[PDB]
């Protein structure tokens, strides 16, 4: 038979990483030829990341640790354009290296809850010595962490346990109402993604509820829609790795001020789970399949999707 999966959820949650993971697990993965393609975007994301932190030092009034870094910042803007989509000079490598190692830039990086910094930022900057080398070809894990501009709908085909899978991702691209319907029609199961580590993000001037509650209010709509009654709702509470680290210093009471439990990862993780699951108005007709994932962790995603497939099997 044929199985249609629709990925949903907030921007920067896991959706496009999951689709890439399906290619790594249930398809050939990424060829060395296809890896060369990404060398360009790797460097692009690296520079975009460091820029974003520098920029945020403005909003957060965080000065440079070492006075001299201001000139390195300036060099970055001059040399950046010359990162001509497949070449990072040792000149430029050192510039970024010095900035990322700066006491002040770090101080700002640690406050990434006060702005919006991509979660692939720390992955690249810590690996510069490897990325900067002239004969570098992006590893399987490197291609996984690359951030490309979303276009219309992304799709992937794979066969797993004698099933023809078609997985759809629409997010980011503000799509037409009539192109949304084409994605809902005949959907077997929805995989809704939630970024657990989004719990401590600090409110912007436009929003009227924290990000977790926005991802909630969306779920409350997907889950209880007339279109999805005979549809399996799978919930990936993603970014559990970051969430575990975050919960060590920033209490879940930042996000749910009414939360009376301890600031252990396990209790808080389970509490968030309850919050999304409780939005299901139909318990007599429907149940939500929840998994705590780490989308960048191929092994973990493999396990989880395996468990997801078994659900789909006995529900056809």
């Amino acid at each position: 038979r044929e199985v249609k999966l629709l990925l949903l959820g907030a921007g920067e949650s896991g959706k496009s990483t999951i689709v890439k993971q399906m290619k790594i697990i249930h398809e050939a993965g990424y060829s060395e030829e296809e890896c060369k393609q990404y060398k360009a975007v790797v460097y692009s994301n690296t520079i975009q990341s460091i820029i974003a932190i520098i920029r945020a030092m403005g909003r957060l009034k965080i000065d440079f640790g070492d006075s001299a870094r201001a000139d390195d910042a300036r060099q970055l803007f001059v040399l950046a354009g010359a990162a001509e989509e497949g070449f990072m000079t040792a000149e430029l490598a050192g510039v970024i290296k010095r900035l990322w190692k700066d006491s002040g830039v770090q101080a700002c990086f640690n406050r990434s809850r006060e702005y919006q910094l991509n979660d692939s930022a720390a992955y690249y900057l810590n690996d510069l010595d490897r990325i900067a080398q002239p004969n570098y070809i992006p590893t399987q894990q490197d291609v996984l962490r690359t951030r490309v501009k979303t276009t219309g709908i992304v799709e992937t085909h794979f066969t797993f346990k004698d099933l023809h899978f078609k997985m759809f991702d629409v997010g980011g691209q503000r799509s037409e109402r009539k192109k949304w319907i084409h994605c809902f029609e005949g959907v077997t199961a929805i995989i809704f993604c939630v970024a657990l580590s989004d719990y401590d993000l600090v409110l912007a001037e436009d929003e009227e509820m924290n990000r977790m509650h926005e991802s909630m209010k969306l779920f409350d709509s997907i889950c209880n829609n007339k279109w999805f009654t005979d549809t399996s709702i799978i919930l990936f509470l993603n970014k559990k790795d970051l969430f575990e680290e975050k919960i060590k210093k920033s209490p879940l009471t930042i996000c749910y001020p009414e939360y009376a439990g301890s600031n252990t990862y396990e209790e808080a993780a389970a509490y968030i789970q309850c919050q999304f699951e409780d939005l299901n108005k139909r318990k007599d007709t429907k149940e939500i399949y929840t998994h705590f994932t780490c989308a960048t962790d191929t092994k973990n995603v493999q396990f989880v999707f395996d468990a997801v497939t078994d659900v789909i099997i006995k529900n056809n």
Partner: protein, 39 residues
């Protein structure tokens, strides 16, 4: 209606950090510099 979904869907799905996806363009590096020239 099933319309109140579509509005909130492509708002929430278009959230998150930007100027962080795709290839690094000169217009992007310029706006980065322009900002830097104040703090």
């Amino acid at each position: 209606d099933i319309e109140g979904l579509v509005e909130l869907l492509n708002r929430v799905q278009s959230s998150g950090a930007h100027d962080q996806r795709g290839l690094l363009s000169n217009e992007e590096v310029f706006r980065a510099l322009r900002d830097f020239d104040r703090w």
